[model samples]
Target chain A: CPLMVKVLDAVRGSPAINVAVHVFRKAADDTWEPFASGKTSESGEPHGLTTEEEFVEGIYKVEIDTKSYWKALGISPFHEHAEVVFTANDSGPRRYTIAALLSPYSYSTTAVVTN
Target chain B: CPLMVKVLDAVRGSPAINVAVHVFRKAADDTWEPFASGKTSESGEPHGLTTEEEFVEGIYKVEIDTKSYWKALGISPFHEHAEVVFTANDSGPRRYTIAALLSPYSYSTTAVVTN
Candidate 1:
């Protein structure tokens, strides 16, 4: 089962901020739709990102509420939004990792592009 | 004018990949150094990791290789990398977002603590 696994967290020892991640599966011609959604843990560890135990081969999309997460902390945000687009190829039984880092105003996404 | 700003990206339209970032300043009672080091942006935009115009406040550190950025895309990484720690306590001005996302085996970091 080839699956795309992803994880989300804030920089360093920062406290946990609420965040929701939505997973998408690529269809026939190459389109996407919602698969799953989740938020971070109370301790701010990577709670919501996808795990190898949660998926199989397909393309995926992660939609996040980057603004609301900040508002919860009383911080003003310059970034109204953000996203990550990636694919999970092959139907092999191995783990793939996609990691995301974000603050109230900006964010980033990276994936394991190796074999 | 006090300030504390940060920015890093690797999500969405996703094409550029290669990462390096180093910037720390929180001496006196605390301890940190190396003002800056950088990477990213071949189309990855948000290259080298920063700009609240270089900074004002204190407390910051970002070091990354994340398994050699997925080992030049040959992909064979169990993700032997990852880290993020943040603080920008208002030396004045505005803007502070600490975002980091990577793919190899796993990674996640988020912040948006409110106004």
Candidate 2:
């Protein structure tokens, strides 16, 4: 399944921009390597990474580059970055979409596996 | 449907304590009022609020008092509070369990509706 990462502005209820994202997969060696990377578009979604990479059953993490984004938005840096860890287990007949509901200080992410 | 707020020490992968929480429901006048309140127990969970309150189809918010908790842990106060807003619609096939996966600086919540 492909991983979809979306960043939202919780305060304004709008799409957030310029947030950098990096996706990593835990390897069999138990070390994590960069699997894909992207920045949020006008729609506040990271592109090209999920569609280009092949996902497998493993521990995966997506780290949002919040510091730069906060600086870009002229907001005080509350948190350095928000790292979301999830399991990409090939369990069912649905694709995985992981969307991050983010603000300056807090964030929430939900994984929706839909057919 | 009920809300479950879980606080975790992200740095140590353990439960956090002494956190305060408030739950609010949007009224017909569009004013948000406190519906329940509690503090985190030894297991890092806010008890009694969810089971005691009746959840209807409306907008609900759960605010976590992060300042005191962070001060209790001697961590620099990064965020004042973390509020999670969600719609508690009576969807089919299950009951809702809005779970907040909270850390010190950031948080993520998932609404798990199980039968």
Candidate 3:
């Protein structure tokens, strides 16, 4: 796979399971076009969002539905959603892993890209 | 002061210096009102963003100018900017430290809140 996401609950200090993730690529005309979507597994990773051929060079946005994730756990979060946007496969074909740490009112995201 | 920020360059694996940071608070009319702004020091922290008396319980937004930071270092970043929005001091007076990790194409933010 070309892209993957890992979510961790900072408050609980564990993997954030069952969080929904949506991926989109920016179209030539500047609109965001949907690419792939899934939910995190028990290990906090969403598997097989896209293959190398499908994940081409472009600006990509990853949206993590954090509100629902926190609300389901009986906490009210602040942000409506959590999003990470970036250019991908520009220098060359690279594999990406976005690691996000979440709290009820805060979150952090880091990306690990490898050629 | 009640709020602080620490920024690290994930790519360079060092403190991100001279990066601009802006802060805003949500108003009663739901508009974002500017509160404070500053640049990161050599220690990767912005000093005195807000005093405890002014940092009351409310929803706040912190915007980090990542593009400028990366561009200044001769790299093109992916995101237009990076932002963190959250409710602060809801339960009581609290201090917040937003620690952010950034790369040319990826970034992560984490918050440490205390009473």
Candidate 4:
């Protein structure tokens, strides 16, 4: 399966514009890595992190620090953390989207525009 | 395939706590419906819109009011209008979710926890 990422600025109260993104491949030994990471674009883009290209097929999870990412600015966010766990088989080139949003008290994320 | 909706509160400047949800089924004439509508809960839940029970396998879209929902509170939103378009087949029970967020500037939505 292929995946792509589309970041959206979904905010209601206080928004967390700057976010530190982390993507790791769940290894067979249950370890992780700094596969990819980036901050939200000026336009709140999910493109920075990208979907996936040549990464080995396996499980993946993206972590976003909504609390620490927002609280630092004197704002209390809703979601403290969001975990997106998915599996990819070594079948073909995959394109997908990992999108996310940050608010004062919460956060949201999803894998979109997948093929 | 079934879908689900979750609303997240991702904010930076101000916040939009209240939201009006609308779901429409594209008809043969390409018209919409008042099918289902509701405001988000205090907890920013996507469990309201729900995935699908008997939505009659077809083209569907969810609409949100980012401006009116946020502007009235004296806050200038970053992004206006968040829409989600998807298709459902006459398959099985198909459990899914439709989520959204109400923020002063922007909004984000997606289908989550599908099985």
Q: Give per-residue CA lDDT, model 4, range B1-115, as digits (tens).
A: 2544445544421122456667788888888765666665443433346444556778888877666655766677776667888776555344545556556555555444323
The residue ranges of model 3 lying beyond 4 angstroms of the native Cα positions read B1-9, B12-115
Off-target runs (Cα >4 Å) in candidate 1 are: A1-15, A29-31, A43-54, A91-93, A112-115, B1-115
- Please provide, for model 3 over A36-70, each residue's C-alpha lDDT reduced to its tens digit, 9 standing for 90 to 100: 99999877888889998898888999999999999
How high is the TM-score of chain A in each model?
Answer: 0.66, 0.88, 0.95, 0.69
Per-residue lDDT tens digits for candidate 1, residues B10-87, read 332243345654556767967677776666554332443445566656667666665666676667667565556666
Encode model 4's per-residue lDDT on A8-39: one tens digit a residue: 33342212346666777777688876677766
What's the TM-score of candidate 3 when only chain A is evaluated? 0.95
Name every residue pair that clashes in candidate 3: A108-B109, A109-B107, A109-B108, A109-B109
lDDT of 2 by residue, B1-115 (tens): 2556656555434456778889999998989998888888866677767652476678988888877877887777667888878786565323554445555667655554434
lDDT of 2 at A17: 74
**Poorest lDDT segment (10 consecutive residues) of candidate 2 chain A:** A88-97
**Please, what are the lDDT tens digits per residue for candidate 3 over residues B40-113?**
98768887888978988889999999999999999989999999998885674356778788888887777766
List the candidate 4 regions with Cα displacement exceeding 4 Å.
A1-115, B1-4, B12-16, B46-53, B78-80, B91-93, B101-106
**Best prediction by lDDT:** 3
Per-candidate TM-scores read 0.44, 0.49, 0.53, 0.44
Q: How close is candidate 3 to the true structure, as a TM-score?
A: 0.53
- Model 3 chain B scores worst on lDDT over the 10 consecutive residues at B89-98
Native contacts present in each candidate (fraction): 0.17, 0.00, 0.00, 0.00
Winning model by TM-score = 3
